[PDB]
Structure 1
Amino acid sequence: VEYRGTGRRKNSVARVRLVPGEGNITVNNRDVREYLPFESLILDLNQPFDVTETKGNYDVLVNVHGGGFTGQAQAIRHGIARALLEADPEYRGSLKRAGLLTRDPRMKERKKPGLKAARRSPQFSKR
């Protein structure tokens, strides 16, 4: 009696299982607050329970890897929204309107030859 969802953000992948519960989140066998540095990250990933009106209704077990704490926190949010589609496909309308079903396609841009970075050009001097 659990629902699964895979969330991705940057280079992070979260495997999210929803079990009925009081609203706890565990990330790699650690409390989400002992795993993530900011409370603003915790509010970001609890967005799917807000727009769906299911706060304190499920427990979240997360297996996450790759990226940093922000990419992981937002991969968990993507995974929770995907897992909520399994619990009730009627959540899709509210989740889609909030933008929580989109896989954020923003990834690190490759460095280009001749430039100092993806876009940063060297200092120019016409002399």
Structure 2
Amino acid sequence: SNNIKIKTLDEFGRSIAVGKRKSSTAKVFVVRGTGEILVNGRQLNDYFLKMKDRESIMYPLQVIESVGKYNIFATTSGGGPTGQAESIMHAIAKALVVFNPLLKSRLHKAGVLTRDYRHVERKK
């Protein structure tokens, strides 16, 4: 038989997904809201100083035009700012599919559902 069980919102209406980039990992909690984001309990502008990192996090929500329709509680560890910001980007895209599985094709086409494989390679 198959090893896939339909993903569903939890008891509190939250979609939980994990993402990875380089050595960084991110576990995000997406719920229906008004666009509030928290990174490790801190404001987005505090945790991520680079605006390009902030724009990376917002991209999946911008593809489905739902930037003001969800509250995101992102927890990230490992690597640096770029790895964490893009690991959060990847995790938000994977968590948004539960709210509307019809938008997976648009998320895949935008490139946010693909795990970036590149990592530091020991010179050979």
Q: Calculate the TM-score normalised by the size of structure 2.
A: 0.87
1:86 maps to which of 94, 98, 103: 98
The aligned counterpart of 1:67 is 79
Aligned pairs for 1:102-113 (under 5 A) are 102-112=114-124
1:13 maps to which of 20, 25, 30: 25
Larger Rg: 1
- Paired residues of 1:4 and 1:86 also in contact (CA < 8 A): no
Measure the CA separation in 2 of the matches of 1:45 and 1:28.
14
Aligned pairs for 1:107-122 (under 5 A) are 107-112=119-124
Measure the CA separation in 2 of the matches of 1:84 and 1:28.
20
Measure the CA separation in 2 of the matches of 1:4 and 1:91.
17
What RMSD in Å do the two structures reach over aligned CA positions? 0.9
The aligned counterpart of 1:33 is 45
Measure the CA separation in 2 of the matches of 1:43 and 1:96.
18
Once superposed, which parts of structure 1, at least 4 consecutive aligned residues long, lie more than 4 Å away?
none
SS in 2 for 1:46: helix
Q: CA deviation at 1:88?
A: 1.2
Structure 1, residues 105-125: CA drift from partner, whole Å, max 9, x if none? 01001134xxxxxxxxxxxxx
Identical aligned pairs, as a percentage? 40
SS in 2 for 1:86: coil
Q: Which amino acid aligns with 1:92?
A: K
Aligned pairs for 1:38-57 (under 5 A) are 38-57=50-69
Q: Does 1:98 align with 2:81?
A: no
Between Structure 1 and Structure 2, how many residues are aligned? 112
- 5+ residue gaps, structure 1, are 113-127
Measure the CA separation in 2 of the matches of 1:38 and 1:24.
18
- 5+ residue gaps, structure 2, are 1-12
Measure the CA separation in 1 of the matches of 2:88 and 2:99.
16
Structure 1, residues 79-99: CA drift from partner, whole Å, max 9, x if none? 000000111111101100000
Q: Calculate the TM-score normalised by the size of structure 1.
A: 0.85
